C-alpha cells in the first residue's frame, strides 16, 4: 500500500478536463484507488464519486493505491498531477 498527500492549486480544483484526465490515468490500474478529502474518501477510478467530493483550489487530500500494481500506479498518479498543474 502507498499513500501521499498532495495540496491542490488549480484554479479549477478537481472539476472539468483536469478531473477527467485523473479519472482516466487512476482507472489504467487494477490497485486500488482513493482520494480522501477532509475524512471522506473515494473511489479514484469514479468520476462521480470525483466530483461528489467537491476538491476546490487551495484543498488537502491524500491518495491511497493498494494492489499489485501500487508503484507505478502511485507513480503515475504523482506525474498526472504534476503535468495537469493539479498539485
Request: aromatic share 4%; net charge negative; charged share 25%.
Amino acid at each position: 500500500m502507498e499513500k501521499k498527500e498532495f495540496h491542490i492549486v488549480a484554479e479549477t480544483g478537481i472539476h472539468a478536463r483536469p478531473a477527467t484526465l485523473l479519472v482516466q490515468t487512476a482507472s489504467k490500474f487494477n490497485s486500488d484507488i482513493n482520494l480522501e478529502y477532509k475524512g471522506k474518501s473515494v473511489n479514484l477510478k469514479s468520476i462521480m464519486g470525483v466530483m461528489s467530493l467537491g476538491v476546490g483550489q487551495g484543498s488537502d487530500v491524500t491518495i491511497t493505491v493498494d494492489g499489485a500494481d501500487e508503484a507505478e500506479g502511485m507513480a503515475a498518479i504523482v506525474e498526472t498531477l504534476q503535468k495537469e498543474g493539479l498539485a
